[PDB]
Design a protein around this ligand. Structure first.
Ligand SMILES: [Zn+2]
Lengths: 482, 734, 49, 745
RNA sequence: UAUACCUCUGCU
RNA sequence: AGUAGUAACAAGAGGG
């Protein structure tokens, strides 16, 4: 090494090396390339921790703050607003479960409520509840020596997930999540008074954002998520051995500024000796809904749906009475899962930072605060949808809600698949962008990238939907370009 | 001095730890201090959310049990007896922290803002700050290393450590010297300020550490780069906006001087381009303000010596700082300029001095005592010195003074021994005076090493030899012996500064084309100037104005283009072009435009927009080809390609936007422009581009090889960006 | 320690901090003491130190 | 109408809406079980890439050590680790050529560093594998254990108090064949009550053979990396042992001093400067070219970066870099490459089995994978168990070729840089030429030439030249386009744009304490407004949301709210008691003062004038028991992960809110229960030492002497001068005590 | 063997 | 059952 001096080695070794080792640039052209390959199999089931579009609220008028009052007392209050109860019957079964136990649990819960006093409510450990909360389902731990010679002793199943197919409902969910409502869902804490002009400008711009966003249905999901995950974490930590009831509550304000308390259903926590951040809490969700599950029975594989009552509703001209269902289920979560659920409000930041950047970019070139134009000067000029007529342009207000929904759904349906798909497809989007900027893009091994992407599309509705969205984008691009 | 030795006894009694106190060394004590069972938490956000749900998650010293009650008024338990893993510390509730803050022991803390000065100075500047209006425009930012610690009394880490040790740990100080008043005054002042403040020494040391030593960081910054402005970047700049703001406290002389030069330079370079530069300059001087202070009242009171500044001072009638004094004598510079350069140099004793060496030809009238001289100086060179005086001694004194002032290698080479002279107030004089008071006491070797010329005899002129003798035809290198008012300076329309004898002192062309980034904010209130500072601004706004007013200018391009070219909106753009290129650029451009008109059918408005501002100058009749125009921007010259997109001008069709230096200047006309199917003219002088190259016309040529073709002959040419094209020489001549 | 001694002494007097470490210190006259033993004569080491 | 947010990209360029392609608001992937399957996968793949190499059994270990360097040249685009020593040395030489006297000063700085470096410096840093306990431990302990063992055996040069002397001992320790180490085990006694069993820990001395100790010293632990984004499948990461740390420190310190002075080096600078370097190279590449030339940029990722980088080559590098330097310095640095060349890897926890019929589960140690029937496992697993057994030794597995994540740094980047440095016009002298920036596997490369085929030649030349030194560009994940757009989640589009979504996880309650979290929270918002284009409106909302999270997390809601927690009452007492409400900290039920202009001002500072004098006297009472006095070097510090792990400094005033939460207690049940007492005792000795040397908390006291002697010597003079020039009965009492103690051994 | 209890642990 | 996803949780350890 000390006495080494290069005469011309790399060129010699280069000459020696096989010609098969090359980096051939294949020029990139979107008009040529194919759509992504979506998987086949049974349709993807709902996997959220609570009902999204199909949820139903028993609400009451209540001037309290956001988070004041005993939740169970507020729950009892909401329970009263519904008159037309019934004896509970099973209308849609949970194919893999002892469905009678769900029915017993509902009645048990409903009675334990009627008979309680105080703040907290712990359910008695009945066997049909034990079953639903997975009591004792952990195989007992043994030294290897004492079980060396058992026939069926294997390592835990470690195969990749079972592939699933893209259903229509996940797109429907996003369509509703991306919509306005008639209730203020988000209540922001106070701020130091504005002094600098830019702080006045900020607050002026911030009011618009808060308007378009606080009423968006995705924000309601944020609050349900923050409430549920907070309640569960705290309950999990404090009451490790008890089966604690947690009512699914949110607070909001009418368009009149009138404060309202909404009850969606209940949650029944299992035991929670959580150690590792992945460790699981089992629980039982019990949520109200008008939606007939049988009209989309694939969406509800994991659910056992009861019918529990009836109520009247008015249409535009006509008016008719409909039945109310109780979507019951056993579900699970982990410290890390609900830690990130507690923080779902940051979804607001992801959306609004994108929007604000767009507003600012135009404000720069126009040399003027382009906020009031963008929001008040109403113009549909951002592609954000596809109808039979074709591509549809939306307003900046709509874009806020679309981007907020995207962020919120990225949180609700977090997954290694999404993590992978998002990472790899980004490269393809950039390659498409590069061509569209006429920068003469080139790829070395494209089908390796396609496989890298496609490997990540397995069974997650959100991932599947994003894969679809990418194709619809690809086609949309190919059309206007070709 | 007791309870510590009692404690130590009670400890040493126990063999458990007397083992340790004897076995483990003072070095190894550092190792066993960090010896812990505990892990660096991986997910503290999760853990804290988990733990705050628990009753007793906080750990506090056991003395808490004596200090605060076990149960509070409402029945809350404040502390328990369960001890924290690996500590003599107990587990307590957050209600303990609150009880303390509402009923615990009160302490004296009113001097704490002296300790946390670094923090409270942030508030101080903000509380006394003034907000202006918010301007919206393309905010270009330079990623640059800058100071983060405003009020950093600059001294190196160990130099600060010494000072800290002195103040908080006086007896347990190490064993080093206190360099100078730099450290001493800080130590005494900080010791005075922190006089008996009841607070942990560790905090005092820590705050001092954060306070004294410099800290820098790479940050994207637009405008003022001074520390106090860096402190509030988040408040003062955004993607598309500037929040005009002046922080409390007064500016720094160095910063003021620095930004003054930058302003004056810009004013000068702008004025040059205008008609009646002198009129344009005076206007800008009266309108411009630095850090919300009149540029004029600054120039009235500022001693800065710089060519652009002096041009402004001359224009405004303020006297230029041409004069100074050194070694007792008074120096007045009659021509040249002080081009200074910081350097380190070795004496004859191989001692390293730190000089502010001057470059360039300079001429001085030197007068003092009983001796006067004319001095001609080069970079570390005595070109000529003609000296006269009432006594040979007085002459020789001035000769020495000048031979020093020369900063020649000879004189430095000649310095034997070390230089450690110290002025009256125990002040160490600068190297220039050090070298003086040296040779003034011993100029023996200096004269032996200086050297001697033979020279031609001239009446009234004599030479001087190193032994003190006078010689008619021999003399020390550069020295001649031979037996005073404030000069009236004038300046003309075009900013040439002349003396009363009609000789050139300062030329605006000689002003350094250096685009350094200002320290303090500069605000021009001039129509001649764009709203924003810097060349990037000039580009973006220039190309922005064109697009906003496109249709109005497109017709103007057809009818009466000579007027379009003389639009004074194109003037600040010209400053970005080198002096000696504007004419041929504008000529080359104007002819390319004419070709587009002569040759009907061909039309490329984007090409027109791109090149239009280059047309704003009296053109030349040159016939040279150009593949790109150069633009001097932030030092490095950028090349705007004539054909197609560039880093400077980039038309993006996907966005339908012109992008200038990465910044959108706007969307060109609705769609009209994307629909421009044509064959390309207005790229070459007397040539037309007619699509892809065809090999039938032989081997490909280059732009330099296009003065050997018949009028009508078609040929292949490497036109740019690795593109060959078919080119035809047109018959007529625009 | 030694430097802590030096500093401790100079802090409770008006004595300047010596550059090198002395060997003893007289309290009555308040004088830092540098002892010098040698096989050579005396003036050599005296004027050396 | 069906909504599709990707359709935004029809109008908006992808870079400008890149925030939508980053799902960073949901929990990232986490590994539930063990990383044995991943460790084995790595170890297999590593060899499988070098399969054509030369196998040899190690003399001192018996490990099946594979050597691919100077092996056959590859002949396919698959990943390969067959680098070439002479080809490396050529690049390293060229790098020397292009930077006159860089290696000189680089080494020189490392020399002064080595000479001056205390042993203390090794207590800093990430956790290390403690060969003593066969588990990962904090550096401070992992070191202290090794030193104690060295001391109990015949090694005590480190007693000097300088890293190199400790570093010497490590090489000598390889000689002592019978290394004596103390074990701890759980015994059970019998207790009577005025009779029940009792648990208690006992110690058991054991001696290890050369074979063992040498392996344990060359052992590198393995784990699954968690919370990793962008990826479907988990990866295995590695943790080094206590032996090789000291050397790696100096090799990295050298490689750092090298990297600090290279334009094409992305390390060790921050994002703002990385972008400045990327700007510089583009500016330079465009200025250096002619108007009739092309420029292409390739967005670059190197596939299987660590698996295909060889310690032997690192040896070649370290030697060639040090060429002409003192041989003790030449040898000292060469250690780590060698120790890595002969590195062996632990295989984690092992596996867990499950009986459906019997409803039971069981654990099996990785060591047992040698002696185990393969009826339990599945195909992919049992095949891996097969392939690994040929390499497996003494529980661990030999890993001569390649590297693993989390072992070594910087020097690998110096390899990549030298290939970039090769691309100068003045070196290549072709119709094409190149330049760029690189950090680890990530690289951006600008290739210029006269024609598109000219560029192709440059791509291939660069690509093959990389292979000749064991660098495999990813043909799947790397791509190329005309210079204009293209690096480590930075996105350049005629200039660097913003990527705010990357930082979203940092917007929350950091969970250090009430005091630190407030400073971190506001600063996060502040630095993003500056660096990642977080606008005013969104930043205000960010303040709002943080306050909401801060208040809920710490149960410190405003004193006038009607919520009900465990604190609301005590916070209410305070609120009523208080006269100037605005002075109260958010942690004490006060109002949020913050807005865009305040973000850089600590809360206590910001509210100082508005505080009740009693309240602030209590709040900042320096005698409060909630804080525990740190050291200057650790004051106001927290830990953050962007990179592997880093310290984050924050600005805050020490108050009663500057507390630390409870420690983990699981260790109480384990055999290491005594470490708590060790810690409890060790601290108490420093607690009193500091009373004798308050200076020790600021600067570490350099001294080789009995801790007690130092305390006594001062205890005398303090006691004396406190009288001499400051009662003699107290003085005599102190001296009597000083002597009285000193008598006791 | 089963049922009750009791103690320690919740990143080790 | 359910969580989950290339391997785990569905309490672990002890009073054996
Ligand atoms: Zn609140």
């Amino acid at each position: 090494v000390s006495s080494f001096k290069a005469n011309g080695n790399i060129e010699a070794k280069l000459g020696a090396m096989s010609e098969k080792v090359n980096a051939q640039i294949e020029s990139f052209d979107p008009r040529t390339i194919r759509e992504l390959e979506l998987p086949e199999g049974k349709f993807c089931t709902q996997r959220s921790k609570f009902l999204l579009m199909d949820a139903m609220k028993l609400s009451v008028l209540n001037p309290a703050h956001e988070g004041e009052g005993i939740p169970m007392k507020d729950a009892k209050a909401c329970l009263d607003t519904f008159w037309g109860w019934k004896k509970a019957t099973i209308i849609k079964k949970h194919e893999k479960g002892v469905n009678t136990n769900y029915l017993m649990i509902w009645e048990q819960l409903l009675e334990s409520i009627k008979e309680m006093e105080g703040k907290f409510l712990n359910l008695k450990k009945t066997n049909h509840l034990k079953w639903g909360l997975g009591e004792g389902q952990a195989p007992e731990k043994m030294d290897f020596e004492d079980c060396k010679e058992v026939p069926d002793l294997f390592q835990y199943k470690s195969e990749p997930p079972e592939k699933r197919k893209l259903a229509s409902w996940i797109q429907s969910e996003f369509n509703k999540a991306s919509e306005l409502t008639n209730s203020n869902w988000i209540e922001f804490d106070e701020l130091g008074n504005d002094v600098a002009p830019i702080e006045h400008i900020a607050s002026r711009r911030r009011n618009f954002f808060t308007a378009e966003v606080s009423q968006c249905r995705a924000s309601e999901y944020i609050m349900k998520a923050v409430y549920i995950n907070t309640a569960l974490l705290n309950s999990s930590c404090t009451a490790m051995e008890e089966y604690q009831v947690i009512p699914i509550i949110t607070k909001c304000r009418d368009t009149s500024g009138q404060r309202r308390t909404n009850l969606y259903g209940f949650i029944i926590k299992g035991r929670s000796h959580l150690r590792n951040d992945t460790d699981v809490v089992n629980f039982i969700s019990l949520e109200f809904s008008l939606t007939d599950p049988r009209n989309e029975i694939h969406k509800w594989e994991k659910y056992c749906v009861l019918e529990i009552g009836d109520m009247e509703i008015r249409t535009s001209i006509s008016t008719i009475m409909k039945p109310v269902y109780l979507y019951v289920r056993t579900n699970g979560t982990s410290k890390i899962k609900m830690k990130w659920g507690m923080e779902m409000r940051r979804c607001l930041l992801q959306s609004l930072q994108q929007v604000e950047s767009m507003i600012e970019a135009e404000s720069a070139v126009k040399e003027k605060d382009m906020t009031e134009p963008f929001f008040r000067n109403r113009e549909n000029d951002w592609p954000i949808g596809e109808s039979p007529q074709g591509i549809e342009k939306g307003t900046i207000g709509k874009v806020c809600r679309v981007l907020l929904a995207k962020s919120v759904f990225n949180s609700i349906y977090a997954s290694a698949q999404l993590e992978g798909f998002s990472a790899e497809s980004r490269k393809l989007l950039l390659l498409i962008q590069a061509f569209r900027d006429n920068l003469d893009p080139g790829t070395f091994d494209l089908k390796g990238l396609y496989e890298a992407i496609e490997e990540c599309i397995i069974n997650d509705p959100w991932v599947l939907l994003n894969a679809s969205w990418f194709n619809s984008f690809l086609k949309a691009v190919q059309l206007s370009m070709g | 001095s007791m309870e510590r030795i009692k404690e130590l006894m009670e400890m040493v009694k126990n063999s458990r730890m007397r083992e340790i106190l004897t076995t483990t060394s003072v070095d190894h004590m550092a190792v066993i201090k960090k010896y812990t069972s505990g892990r660096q938490e991986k997910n503290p956000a999760l853990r804290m959310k988990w733990m705050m749900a628990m009753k007793y998650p906080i750990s506090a010293s056991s003395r808490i049990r004596e200090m605060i009650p076990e149960k509070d008024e409402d029945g809350n338990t404040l502390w328990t007896n369960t001890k924290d893993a690996g500590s003599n510390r107990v587990l307590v509730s957050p209600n303990a922290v609150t009880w303390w803050n509402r009923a615990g022991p009160v302490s004296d803390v009113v001097h704490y803002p002296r300790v946390y000065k670094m923090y409270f100075d942030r508030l101080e500047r903000l509380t006394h700050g003034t907000f202006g209006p918010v301007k919206f425009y393309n905010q270009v930012k330079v990623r640059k290393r800058v100071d983060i610690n405003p009020g950093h009394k600059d001294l190196t880490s160990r130099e600060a450590q010494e000072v800290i040790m002195e103040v908080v740990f006086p007896n347990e100080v190490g064993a080093r010297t206190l360099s100078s008043d730099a450290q001493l005054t800080i130590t005494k002042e900080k010791k005075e300020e922190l006089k008996n403040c009841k607070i942990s020494p560790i905090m005092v040391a820590y705050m001092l550490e954060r306070e004294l030593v410099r800290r820098t960081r790479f940050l994207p910054i637009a405008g003022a780069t001074s520390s106090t402005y860096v402190e509030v970047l988040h408040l003062t700049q955004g993607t598309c906006w500037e929040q005009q703001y002046t922080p409390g406290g007064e500016a720094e002389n160095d910063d003021l001087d620095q930004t003054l030069i930058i302003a004056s330079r810009n004013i000068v370079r702008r004025s040059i381009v205008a008609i009646d530069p002198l009129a344009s300059l005076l206007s800008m001087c009266h309108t411009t303000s630095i850090s919300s202070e009149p540029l004029v009242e600054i120039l009235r009171s500022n001693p800065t010596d710089e060519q652009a500044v002096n041009i402004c001072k001359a224009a405004l009638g303020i006297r230029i700082n041409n004069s100074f004094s050194f070694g007792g004598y008074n120096f007045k510079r009659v021509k040249g300029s002080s081009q200074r350069t910081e350097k380190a140099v070795l004496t004859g004793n191989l001692q390293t001095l730190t000089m502010t060496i001057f470059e360039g030809y300079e001429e001085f009238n030197v007068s003092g005592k009983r001796a006067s001289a004319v001095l001609k100086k080069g970079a570390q060179r005595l070109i000529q010195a003609i000296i006269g005086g009432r006594t040979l001694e007085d002459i020789l004194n001035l000769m020495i003074t000048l031979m020093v002032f020369s900063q020649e290698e000879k004189m430095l080479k000649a310095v034997r021994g070390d230089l450690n002279f110290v002025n009256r107030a125990n002040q160490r004089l600068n190297p220039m005076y050090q070298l003086l008071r040296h040779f003034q006491k011993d100029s023996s070797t200096l004269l032996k090493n200086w050297g001697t010329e033979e020279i031609d005899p001239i009446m009234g002129i004599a030479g001087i030899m190193p032994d003190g003798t006078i010689n008619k035809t021999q003399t020390l290198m550069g020295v001649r012996l031979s037996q005073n008012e404030r000069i009236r300076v004038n300046i003309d329309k075009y900013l040439r500064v002349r003396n009363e004898k009609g000789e050139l002192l300062i030329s605006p062309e000689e002003v350094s084309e250096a685009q350094g980034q200002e320290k303090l904010p500069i605000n021009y209130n001039s129509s001649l100037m764009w709203e924003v500072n810097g060349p990037e601004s000039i580009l973006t706004n220039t190309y922005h104005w064109i697009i906003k007013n496109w249709e109005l200018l497109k017709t103007q391009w057809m009818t009466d283009p000579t007027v379009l070219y003389n639009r004074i909106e194109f003037e600040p753009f010209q400053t970005l072009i080198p002096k000696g290129n504007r004419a041929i650029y504008s000529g080359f451009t104007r002819t390319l435009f004419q070709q587009m008109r002569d040759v009907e059918g061909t039309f490329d408005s984007i090409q027109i927009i791109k090149l239009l501002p280059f047309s704003a100058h009296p053109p030349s009749l040159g016939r040279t080809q150009f593949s790109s125009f150069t633009l001097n921007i932030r030092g490095a010259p950028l090349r705007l390609l004539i054909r197609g997109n560039s880093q400077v001008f980039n038309y993006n069709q996907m966005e339908n936007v012109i992008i200038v230096l990465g910044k959108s200047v706007g969307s060109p006309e609705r769609s009209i422009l994307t629909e421009s199917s044509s064959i390309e003219s207005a790229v070459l002088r007397g040539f037309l581009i007619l699509g892809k190259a065809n090999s039938k016309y032989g081997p490909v040529l280059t732009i330099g090889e296009l003065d050997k073709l018949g009028r009508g002959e078609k040929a292949n040419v490497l036109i740019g960006q690795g593109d060959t094209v078919l080119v035809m020489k047109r018959k007529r001549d625009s | 320690i030694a430097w802590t001694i030096v500093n401790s002494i100079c802090n409770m007097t008006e004595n300047s901090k010596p550059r090198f470490l002395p060997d003893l210190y007289d309290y009555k006259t308040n004088k830092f003491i540098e002892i010098g033993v040698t096989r050579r004569k005396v003036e050599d080491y005296y004027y050396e130190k | 109408m069906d909504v599709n947010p990707m359709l935004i990209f029809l109008k908006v360029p992808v870079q400008n809406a890149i925030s939508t392609t980053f799902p960073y608001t949901g929990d990232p992937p986490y590994s539930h079980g063990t990383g044995t399957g991943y460790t084995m996968d790595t170890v297999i793949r590593t060899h499988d890439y070098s399969s054509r190499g030369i196998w040899k059994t190690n003399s001192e270990t018996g490990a099946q050590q594979l050597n691919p360097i100077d092996g056959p040249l590859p002949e396919d685009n698959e990943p390969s680790g067959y680098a070439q020593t002479d080809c490396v040395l050529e690049l390293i030489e060229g790098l020397d050529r292009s930077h006159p006297g860089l290696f000189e000063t680089a080494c020189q700085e490392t020399i002064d560093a080595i000479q001056q470096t205390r042993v203390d410096k090794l207590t800093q840093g990430r956790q290390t594998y403690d060969w003593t306990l066969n588990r990962n431990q904090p550096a401070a302990t992992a070191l202290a254990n090794t030193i104690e063992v060295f001391r109990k055996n015949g090694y005590k040069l480190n007693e000097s108090g300088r890293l190199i002397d400790f570093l010497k001992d490590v090489l000598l320790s390889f000689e002592n064949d019978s290394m004596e180490v103390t074990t701890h085990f759980q015994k059970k006694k019998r207790i009577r009550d005025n009779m029940i069993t009792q648990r208690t820990i006992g110690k058991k001395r054991v001696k290890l053979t050369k074979k063992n100790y040498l392996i344990r010293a060359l052992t590198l632990n393995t784990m699954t990396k968690d919370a990793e984004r962008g990826k479907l499948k988990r990866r295995a990461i590695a943790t080094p042992g206590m032996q090789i740390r000291g050397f790696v420190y100096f090799v990295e310190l050298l490689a750092r001093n090298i990297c600090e002075r290279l334009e094409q080096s992305g390390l060790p600078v921050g994002g703002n400067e990385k972008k400045a370097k990327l700007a510089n190279v583009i500016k330079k590449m465009m200025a250096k070219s002619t108007d009739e030339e092309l420029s292409y940029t390739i967005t670059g990722d190197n596939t299987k970066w660590n698996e295909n980088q060889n310690p032997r080559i690192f040896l070649a590098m370290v030697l060639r870099i040090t060429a002409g330097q003192p041989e003790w310095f030449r040898d000292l640095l060469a250690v780590a490459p060698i120790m890595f060349s002969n590195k062996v890897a632990r295989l984690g926890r092992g596996y867990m089995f499950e009986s459906k019929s019997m409803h039971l589960r069981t654990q099996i140690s990785a060591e047992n994978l040698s002696d185990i029937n393969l009826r339990y496992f599945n195909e992919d697993t049992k095949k891996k168990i097969e392939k690994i057994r040929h390499l497996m030794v003494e529980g661990t597995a030999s890993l001569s070729p390649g590297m693993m994540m989390g072992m070594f740094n910087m020097l690998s980047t110096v390899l990549g840089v030298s290939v970039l440095n090769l691309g100068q016009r003045e070196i290549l002298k072709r119709t094409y030429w190149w330049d760029g920036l690189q950090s680890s596997d990530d690289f951006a490369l600008i290739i210029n030439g006269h024609f598109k085929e000219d560029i192709q030649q440059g791509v291939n030349h660069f690509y093959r030249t990389c292979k000749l030194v064991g660098i495999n560009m990813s043909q799947k994940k790397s791509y190329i386009n005309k210079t204009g757009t293209f690096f480590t989640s930075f996105f350049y589009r005629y200039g660097f744009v913003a990527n705010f979504s990357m930082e979203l996880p940092s917007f929350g309650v950091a969970g250090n304490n009430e005091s630190a979290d407030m400073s971190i929270g506001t600063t996060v918002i502040k630095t993003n407004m500056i660096n990642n284009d977080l606008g005013p409106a969104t930043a205000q909302m960010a303040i709002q949301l943080f306050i909401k999270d801060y208040r809920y997390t710490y149960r410190c809601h405003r004193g006038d709210t009607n919520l009900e927690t465990r604190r609301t009452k005590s916070i209410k007492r305070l609120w009523t008691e208080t006269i100037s409400k605005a002075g109260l900290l958010v942690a004490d039920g006060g109002p949020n003062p913050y807005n865009l202009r305040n973000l850089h001002i600590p809360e206590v500072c910001l509210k100082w004038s508005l505080m009740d004098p009693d309240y602030r006297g209590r709040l900042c009472n320096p005698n409060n028991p909630f804080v525990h006095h740190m050291e200057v070097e650790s004051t106001n510090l927290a830990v953050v992960m962007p990179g592997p792990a880093k310290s984050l400094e924050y600005d805050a005033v020490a108050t009663t809110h500057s507390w630390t939460p409870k420690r983990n207690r699981s260790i109480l049940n384990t055999n290491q229960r005594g470490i708590l007492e060790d810690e409890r005792i060790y601290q108490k000795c420093c607690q009193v030492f500091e009373k004798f040397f308050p200076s020790s908390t600021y600067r570490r006291p350099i001294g080789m002497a009995s801790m007690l002697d130092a305390m006594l010597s001062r205890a005398r003079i303090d006691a004396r001068i406190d009288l001499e020039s400051g009662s003699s009965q107290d003085f005599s009492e102190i001296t009597n005590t000083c002597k009285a103690i000193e008598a006791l051994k």
